[PDB]
Design a protein around this ligand. Structure first.
Ligand SMILES: C[C@@H](O)CCC(=O)O
Ligand SMILES: [Ca+2]
Ligand code: NA
Length: 293
């Protein structure tokens, strides 16, 4: 595990997407932008994304899809009314910087705090809703699926505590969602693309005072979840076994993504230190659709 710092002075980094050349496109939630970090050290702003760009994934159209949580109040906190512009799913052209909003509601219900997302092999898009915190109450968590072609958005999970990381098993027959305040990883069986069958179960619950953020799946099927408070990556087997916890040095470790040769480099956002780091990983990551395969 040779650790290296790839970038500093990032304004709450999140949603790393590791390109084939080893460059990383990621979101800076606090600076409200999409940023490109190159291996020669240089950084460039790809696009300004007003609000709270929270997670990213490359899509079948070659554009970067974004979970926009609508904005926080800044370490993040509950957004004062004016700092919140509504949650949405957006799309950014990595060549012009043009930002287009795709969805801001599901049925008659506005999206609250979209957080992270993952494409299935047909181009359907899964994403989590962390909800928003208000003065005396908070939204419940949810997970949504947007049908291939961006034709329809559907509610698949609703009424958990806030949901954060999301991924698919290698065979894409199981969707995983990380429940933030409980440090529980939930597994949902899929009867087919975009459709949960009964709605799921927690396969791992960490002890103590540990919370979950975003995640990435390994080719083995293990789920690697950024773990807040204790500051590590929690590696969870498909059967829920806690395989290991890899310390990162930051209590606010938020996301992980695999890249490099054989997808055996882990790229991790340390959102407390404002850093993007890379780390040797003993096993290869799961190739993401429309990025790695
Ligand atoms: C720390 C989280 O609960 C909020 C932002 C994030 O998804 O990284
Ligand atoms: Ca997240
Ligand atoms: Na990730």
């Amino acid at each position: 595990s040779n650790v290296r710092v790839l970038a500093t002075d990032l304004a709450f980094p999140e949603g790393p997407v590791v390109m084939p050349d080893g460059s990383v496109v990621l979101v800076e939630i606090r600076a409200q932008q999409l940023t490109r970090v190159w291996p020669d050290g240089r950084k460039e702003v790809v696009a300004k994304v007003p609000g709270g760009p929270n997670g990213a994934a490359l899509g079948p159209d070659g554009k970067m899809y974004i979970c926009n949580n609508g904005g926080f109040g800044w370490m993040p906190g509950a957004p004062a009314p004016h700092e919140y512009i509504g949650g949405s799913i957006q799309r950014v052209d990595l060549q012009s910087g043009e930002v287009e909003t795709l969805f801001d509601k599901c049925g008659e219900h506005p999206l609250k705090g979209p957080n992270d997302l993952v494409f299935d092999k047909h181009g359907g898009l899964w994403f989590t809703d962390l909800g928003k915190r208000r003065a005396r109450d908070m939204d419940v968590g949810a997970a949504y699926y947007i049908k291939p072609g961006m034709t329809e958005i559907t509610e698949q999970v609703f009424g958990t505590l806030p949901l954060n990381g999301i991924g698919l098993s290698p065979d894409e027959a199981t969707m995983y969602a990380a429940e933030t305040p409980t440090g529980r990883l939930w597994a949902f069986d899929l009867s087919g693309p975009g459709e949960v069958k009964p709605k799921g179960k927690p396969i791992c619950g960490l002890g103590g005072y540990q919370m979950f953020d975003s995640l990435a799946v390994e080719a083995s099927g293990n789920v690697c979840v950024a773990t807040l408070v204790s500051g590590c990556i929690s590696v969870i087997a498909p059967d829920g076994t806690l395989v290991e916890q890899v310390p990162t040095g930051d209590r606010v470790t938020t996301n992980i993504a695999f890249g490099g040769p054989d997808l055996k480099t882990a790229y991790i956002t340390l959102s407390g230190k404002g850093e993007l780091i890379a780390m040797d990983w003993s096993r290869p990551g799961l190739p993401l659709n429309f990025l790695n395969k």
